[PDB]
Amino acid sequence: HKPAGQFLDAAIDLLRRVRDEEADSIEAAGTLLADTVQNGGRLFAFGAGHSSLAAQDVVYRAGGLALMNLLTVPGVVGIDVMPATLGSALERVDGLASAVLDSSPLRAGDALVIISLSGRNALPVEMAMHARALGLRVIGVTSVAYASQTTSRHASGTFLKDHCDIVLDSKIAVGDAELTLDTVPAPFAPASTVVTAALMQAVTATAAATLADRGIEPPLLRSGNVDGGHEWNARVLEQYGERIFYRR
Amino acid sequence: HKPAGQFLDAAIDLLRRVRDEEADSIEAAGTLLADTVQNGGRLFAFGAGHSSLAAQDVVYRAGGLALMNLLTVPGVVGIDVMPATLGSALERVDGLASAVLDSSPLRAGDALVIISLSGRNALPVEMAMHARALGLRVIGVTSVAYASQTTSRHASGTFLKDHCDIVLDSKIAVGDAELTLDTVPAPFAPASTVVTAALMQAVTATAAATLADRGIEPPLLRSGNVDGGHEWNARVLEQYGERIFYRR
Ligand SMILES: CC(=O)N[C@@H]1[C@@H](O)[C@H](O)[C@@H](COP(=O)(O)O)O[C@@H]1O
Numbered sequence: 411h412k413p414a415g416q417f418l419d420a421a422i423d424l425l426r427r428v429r430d431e432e433a434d435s436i437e438a439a440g441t442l443l444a445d446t447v448q449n450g451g452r453l454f455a456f457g458a459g460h461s462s463l464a465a466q467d468v469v470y471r472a473g474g475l476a477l478m479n480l481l482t483v484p485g486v487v488g489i490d491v492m493p494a495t496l497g498s499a500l501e502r503v504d505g506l507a508s509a510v511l512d513s514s515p516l517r518a519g520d521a522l523v524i525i526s527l528s529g530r531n532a533l534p535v536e537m538a539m540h541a542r543a544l545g546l547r548v549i550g551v552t553s554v555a556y557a558s559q560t561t562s563r564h565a566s567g568t569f570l571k572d573h574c575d576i577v578l579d580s581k582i583a584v585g586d587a588e589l590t591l592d593t594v595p596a597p598f599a600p601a602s603t604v605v606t607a608a609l610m611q612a613v614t615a616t617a618a619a620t621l622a623d624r625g626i627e628p629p630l631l632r633s634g635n636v637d638g639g640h641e642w643n644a645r646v647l648e649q650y651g652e653r654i655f656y657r658r
Numbered sequence: 659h660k661p662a663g664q665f666l667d668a669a670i671d672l673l674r675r676v677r678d679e680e681a682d683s684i685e686a687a688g689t690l691l692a693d694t695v696q697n698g699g700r701l702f703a704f705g706a707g708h709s710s711l712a713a714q715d716v717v718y719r720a721g722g723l724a725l726m727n728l729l730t731v732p733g734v735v736g737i738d739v740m741p742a743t744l745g746s747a748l749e750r751v752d753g754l755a756s757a758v759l760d761s762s763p764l765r766a767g768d769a770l771v772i773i774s775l776s777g778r779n780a781l782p783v784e785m786a787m788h789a790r791a792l793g794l795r796v797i798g799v800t801s802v803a804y805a806s807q808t809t810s811r812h813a814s815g816t817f818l819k820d821h822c823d824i825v826l827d828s829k830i831a832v833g834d835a836e837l838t839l840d841t842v843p844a845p846f847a848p849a850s851t852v853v854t855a856a857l858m859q860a861v862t863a864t865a866a867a868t869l870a871d872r873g874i875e876p877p878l879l880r881s882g883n884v885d886g887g888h889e890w891n892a893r894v895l896e897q898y899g900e901r902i903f904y905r906r
């Protein structure tokens with residue numbers, strides 16, 4: 411009955427929905443990532459604002475793939491920007507996504523994961539459209555409910571999911587808040603990061619397992635806060651350095 | 659049996675452990691945050707690397723408290739820094755934590771949440787020690803198992819949890835990886851961000867509910883990606899601007 415327990419039960423239920431409903435889509439996404447690695451492509455992940463956090467959770471990560479890179483749009487990497495409200499405004503700027511994609515090392519055949527809960531703003535929609543125009547395969551992580559219950563803010567009138575090769579439905583109801591209190595007019599307690607991080611790990615875990623099943627050793631990193639982790643990672647990062655862009 | 663399902667079941671089980679084991683600690687932490695707001699103090703959250711992501715998840719957040727601020731240590735806000743490996747090295751630098759605390763607006767009586775899974779490195783340990791020396795109340799979000807199974811890398815030989823007023827145990831087993839495959843030597847698939855984000859939301863949800871029960875309207879933000887959210891937030895951010903440091 412207490413707020414902590416109510417929220418955790420809501421987050422568990424959302425993870426159960428993802429587990430039971432997105433299993434095939436999660437498998438398809440992880441296989442696409444494994445295919446890209448095997449065929450010599452690169453892997454990148456992007457999200458704006460708090461959606462950036464699920465993307466960061468698979469980059470340079472204990473237990474994660476060394477080959478996963480972060481696509482950084484300046485000002486929307488998390489909420490670090492001053493003022494934080496500018497991050498919201500940058501999501502409406504046409505041409506930012508193309509500037510970032512055209513400057514990056516992404517090329518035809520690469521894989522880009524795009525996390526956007528609403529999927530409705532110019533920046534994530536343009537990112538998917540332009541990435542596909544460049545020949546990239548695009549996985550979207552998005553709450554498809556928003557496409558029926560909100561209006562697109564992109565000039566095309568379309569949503570992120572309309573421009574993805576694979577869509578992972580992150581389930582969050584419109585408003586991104588799981589609890590209400592009678593005395594309190596606004597809902598509170600967002601689970602979207604709990605859910606999207608879990609989806610991303612499920613996707614990358616599938617890619618690692620798929621490579622292994624094909625007799626290809628997945629390039630996995632260890633935690634740097636367990637003795638020997640940094641030594642282990644140095645070997646891996648050097649080995650796959652050519653397709654890793656967060657070190658040299 | 660598939661990797662996605664195995665990971666999601668592991669993450670659910672960790673959320674159940676937090677729900678069933680940390681309920682009283684979560685209540686105590688949220689009450690301390692509510693007490694601080696009521697007594698006129700400020701709220702800040704910090705973590706390094708991927709632990710920064712749980713801190714960011716409660717800042718400028720749909721359904722979250724407008725009064726929660728991010729404490730930014732340059733170079734360890736997420737994994738954005740180039741090269742990402744420098745973030746790991748910065749966690750070992752003595753004096754960085756004090757530099758950041760002494761420059762910030764944090765003052766005696768304020769509340770600081772510190773997220774560190776291992777709790778073993780110089781930066782998070784110094785952050786807690788120096789914050790308490792400044793008169794701050796400190797909530798740590800940390801896997802206490804690390805304090806018995808790893809060695810401290812702080813000069814004191816102590817861990818984060820030894821310097822907290824309240825400890826929230828994030829349960830993750832040493833290594834931060836929930837899956838193994840027979841052919842694959844390293845474990846993979848980290849849940850720490852799934853778990854820590856959920857703990858943080860449970861804490862802030864408790865603070866909002868506690869304020870409400872005391873007849874104090876919690877200063878909650880709405881999603882900017884639902885129509886009217888930015889207008890709603892502008893009112894709130896102006897009202898509580900004096901204790902909000904991510905806008906002006
Ligand atoms: C109060 C608030 O909402 N702040 C931002 C929001 O402006 C931004 O749009 C979202 C990412 O957008 P997306 O996940 O829907 O793509 O992250 C944050 O929530």
Ligand SMILES: CC(=O)N[C@@H]1[C@@H](O)[C@H](O)[C@@H](COP(=O)(O)O)O[C@@H]1O
Pocket residue numbers: 470471472631632633634635643706707708709745746749773774775776777778782
């Ligand atoms: C491969 C790797 O591990 N990268 C960093 C790690 O160096 C850092 O220590 C941790 C935060 O540390 P903490 O959560 O234990 O405080 O975030 C990331 O995992």
